[PDB]
Design a protein around this ligand. Structure first.
Ligand SMILES: CCCCCCCCCCCCC/C=C/[C@H](O)[C@H](N)CO
Ligand SMILES: CCCCCCCCCCCCC/C=C/[C@H](O)[C@H](N)CO
Lengths: 232, 245, 235, 232, 60, 60
């Protein structure tokens, strides 16, 4: 035995940064997208989702990297000075911005990153922030149980396999700069890298296209292709 | 193969899921009232049967004092011992795959996502049945809000063939007539609510179709017997009465 | 202060780099772990697990429960093979979507011995011998028992044992094979034939079904992680 | 002996970075080159190819350096914000982009470099990724053998001296930024530096211009120049 | 953090430099080498090998 | 001088970072502290203090 399995380890399997979200933030004269709130999850994309759903439970420290790409929108010769983007983390319960100049942007206790355009992509790390002892990719249950004494069925009605409505909060991204006379549109791509990963209860990989945050399937349910029984 | 005695119930290969025996972590532990084999309602395996599925501990919600402890206390944990019995003659042929899936989330029948109701998602001891194809619900006025498992997709968007990654046992009528799986408590928490969360899912699929001699129609019984093991509850309060309709 | 020289590569984001980053939530009391059953330390552990093979992929049988069943019978033609498939554990349709193939399709290179377990699911009154053969690449794919005989093979008596394990050892010119169809890293062929026949008495089903499972051995290894082609997202 | 051979060593002989590819990537309103896929090899250029083909077998760890140069194309006063280029490595078997915004760009497991224009050239290192125990600059054989039982001659027909069709994959280069109102055209030049080089079976250097990926020769087959037999 | 001073030459790419770079394929199990005949350690080893001279270079 | 590689995240301001910064008033003789009663070392110390509950929250 001289061939090794260093690259098949769980840490190596997730050691790549996967894009999990693309957020559009526009700066223009203040129906608008001057600030964008994105709920944190890996299920907006399939690749990392499929890799993680190889297992039932996980525990990993995350690393987020933000790549910002700005462009003009129908500019004739209108130009702009280098922009600064504010990415504020809003955990469940904290107030959420209602405008791009709201008081919530003060970031007194909410962590925030101020990224200057043209610099290196903004990278930070997060520890395991799970309420339980491990993350639950699959939850075979509800959060509310409808009881006999409930006045109406909606009291106990809950989404299947949904644990909490506000899983880990949102990221609110704005352009701190005031509006230039010409519109500037930017895309922030968030790349998520698990680290120190531990996994439990392996599961078969998804074989059909994802349909929503659950195991629901709707279309393209015939994956295997035609092949002769005795054809090599 | 050998005697299997738990509490006051005895059953005349057995696989331990993930190589872990059920174990304990002031939790209330009924050493006898709950540690015993409860027999679920028998199902009938025919030539046109697609499969069956049950959810644990939901299947034992009305089984003796185990259900009473489950409903009275707030959060409880329990391992299980599942024993599937299917006796056939030497001239019968077939094979059953018995899979114990942790967090056996199933797919719905409507375009709305995660819209399955608690009543339908918790069938109890009767369980449910897989289907050959995906039948989309069309009753917009009164959606059924029930699962639509697919046999070859395992009801979760994965291929049936890879389901053997889960703890499994094959009842092949030519060699064995019973299967036994010992499941420990598997969850992201040391203890969790049982009324709202199901820890395990038992799926029985007819891998090879049943056949007998040259008979057109043949059906044989399958009986599931589940023994809670090392079950402990905590958070005693008034009794929970779920709305099953 | 300290004179420094910015080397090429500065201000770049390589998604495979391993650099320390600032913590956005310092002094966080993470929930301690527990001993959850089923911990996985390597992805090849999953590949070592046997999983059923979609051996039959006909138009009217694929993407169903019939694609895992291969029909055996006493009336079958003893000269023709039962099943035949190339030893491509990541590109062959019958092996690509297996758990082994799913793990391989995340890597560019693979090397190791395979293990095919064939399970007979007929009556206990049915008996027969099956020749399961592996032919290393280079020659004609065995179209007859007289040819498959010449390669590696095992005889499987249905009456005695209902399951047979055909181990395909690692024999390759290269140290690693590609997980993609390539005639230079071709792995070989697997074929099955009736050694004698299936013999059944009266009042017994004359047609039966066999199942196939594939797994990796302890010598198995993969290399050069990549993105799988199985999962796609509409953009 | 006081004169040394430190500069004639194999490591020193290849210690220079040689350009192996020029790739054109254009950003404009979406027949187009918004993403360019280049197959990895040193045979697109002759210098490094000739240096390597001094020997029959080689084993070296590679170092790639990307130099990006952007320019405007018929701009009047249309301008653009600083661009970010994505260079994604696609090894054989992985899905290939069909558009500049395809899902494959998520880079869940394919390594990728995000390079910000105006910064230092993007440099990474690769180990020896050869299937065999050494690279084969010359392969006197085929990958398929035509057999007597083959239905048609095309089953076993293979290119001479071709080992694998997809040798080591491709690099897909795109501009992550959305299209500015004015077109921007960029050239990415890839410079390849062997390191820790080991070589076997020395060969005479190429004497005539290369014609394709093989030893084929077509023109300029008279290298030596006229000179008198007894002329000093 | 640590105060630093960017010296001239920063952000330049010299094709003859010897700098460490990030690995794009970490934890890669490279194929081990074998004892292939004909290993060359210096280029002057090739020059030491006698080779025929085109002594006659007439037009014809 | 010393060859360095700028890693991603450079030139960013994270409001939760802990980095050393230059002092704008060097060699400042800060006023020494005194033993003021009521020092608090943790915020949970305040939570441990019993405080009255607005149990009745009717409109009037
Ligand atoms: C500006 C600073 C940014 C701070 C960002 C903190 C966000 C915290 C989110 C951490 C975990 C998100 C992703 C991991 C959880 C998975 O989705 C689990 N499987 C949950 O089901
Ligand atoms: C964005 C990350 C880029 C990652 C690039 C990895 C590319 C891997 C290619 C490595 C080897 C290419 C060149 C060396 C091989 C020679 O052509 C051999 N003589 C093959 O005949």
């Amino acid at each position: 035995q001289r061939r090794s399995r260093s690259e098949s380890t769980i840490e190596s399997f997730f050691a790549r940064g996967a894009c999990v979200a693309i957020i559009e933030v526009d700066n223009e004269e203040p129906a608008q997208k001057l600030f964008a709130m994105w709920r944190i999850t890996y299920k907006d994309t399939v690749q990392l989702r499929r890799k993680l759903e190889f297992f039932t439970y996980s525990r990993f420290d995350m690393e987020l990297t933000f790549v910002v790409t700005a462009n003009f929108t129908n500019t004739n010769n209108g130009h702009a000075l280098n922009q600064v983007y504010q990415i504020m983390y809003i955990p469940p319960g904290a107030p959420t911005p209602k405008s791009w100049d709201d008081y919530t942007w003060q970031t007194s206790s909410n962590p925030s990153i101020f990224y200057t355009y043209g610099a290196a992509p903004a990278r930070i790390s997060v520890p395991y922030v799970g309420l339980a002892n491990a993350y639950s990719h699959f939850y075979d249950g509800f959060a509310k149980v409808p009881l006999k004494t409930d006045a109406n069925d909606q009291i106990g009605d809950s989404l299947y396999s949904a644990m909490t409505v506000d899983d880990f909060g949102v990221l609110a991204i704005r352009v701190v700069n005031d509006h230039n006379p010409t519109k500037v549109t930017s895309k922030v791509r968030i790349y998520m890298k698990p680290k120190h990963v531990r996994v439990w209860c392996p599961r078969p990989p998804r074989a059909v296209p994802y349909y929503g945050p659950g195991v629901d399937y709707k279309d393209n349910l015939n994956p295997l292709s035609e092949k002769g029984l005795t054809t090599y | 193969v050998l005697q299997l005695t738990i509490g006051n119930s005895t059953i005349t290969n057995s696989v331990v899921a993930y190589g872990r025996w059920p174990e304990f972590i002031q939790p209330t532990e009924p050493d006898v009232a709950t540690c015993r084999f409860y027999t679920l309602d028998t199902v009938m395996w025919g030539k046109e049967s697609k499969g069956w599925w049950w959810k644990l501990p939901d299947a034992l919600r009305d089984m003796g004092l185990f259900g009473q402890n489950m409903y009275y206390h707030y959060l409880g944990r329990s391992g299980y011992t599942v024993h599937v019995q299917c006796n056939a003659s030497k001239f019968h042929q077939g094979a059953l795959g018995v899979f114990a899936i942790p967090e056996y989330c199933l797919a719905g029948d409507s375009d709305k996502q995660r819209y399955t109701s608690y009543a339908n998602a918790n069938p109890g001891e009767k369980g449910g049945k897989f289907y050959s194809q995906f039948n989309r619900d069309t009753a917009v006025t009164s959606p059924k809000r029930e699962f639509c498992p697919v046999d070859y997709l395992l009801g979760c968007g994965v291929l049936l063939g890879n389901a053997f990654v889960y703890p499994h046992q094959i009842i092949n009528l030519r060699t064995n007539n019973s299967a036994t799986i010992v499941l420990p408590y598997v969850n992201a928490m040391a203890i969790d609510s049982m009324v709202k969360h199901n820890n395990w899912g038992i799926a029985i699929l007819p891998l090879s179709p049943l056949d007998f001699a040259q008979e057109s129609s043949v059906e044989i019984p399958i009986t599931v017997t589940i023994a809670p093991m090392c079950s402990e509850f905590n958070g005693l309060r008034n009794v929970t009465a779920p709305k099953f309709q | 202060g300290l004179p420094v020289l910015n080397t090429p590569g500065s201000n770049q984001y390589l998604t495979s780099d391993n650099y320390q980053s600032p913590c956005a939530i310092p002094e966080f009391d993470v929930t301690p772990p527990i001993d959850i059953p089923g911990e996985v330390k390597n992805m090849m552990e999953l590949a070592e697990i046997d999983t059923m093979i979609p051996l039959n992929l006909e138009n009217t049988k694929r993407n169903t429960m019939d694609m895992y069943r291969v029909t055996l019978s006493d009336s079958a033609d003893l000269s023709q093979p039962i099943l035949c498939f190339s030893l491509s554990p990541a590109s062959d349709p019958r092996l690509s979507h297996t758990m082994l193939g799913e793990v391989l399709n995340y890597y560019t290179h693979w090397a190791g011995s395979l293990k095919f377990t064939f399970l007979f699911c007929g009556s206990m009154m049915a008996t027969g011998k099956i020749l399961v053969a592996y032919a290393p690449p280079g020659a004609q794919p065995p179209t007859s028992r007289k040819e498959a005989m010449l390669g590696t093979h095992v005889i499987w008596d249905l009456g005695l044992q209902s399951s047979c394990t055909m181990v395909v050892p690692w024999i390759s010119n290269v140290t690693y094979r590609q997980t993609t169809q390539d005639s230079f890293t071709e792995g070989g062929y697997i074929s099955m034939f009736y050694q004698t026949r299936i013999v059944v008495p009266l009042s017994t089903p004359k047609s039966m079904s066999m199942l196939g499972f594939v797994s990796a051995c302890n010598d198995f290894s993969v290399r050069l992680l990549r993105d799988t082609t199985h999962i796609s997202q509409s953009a």
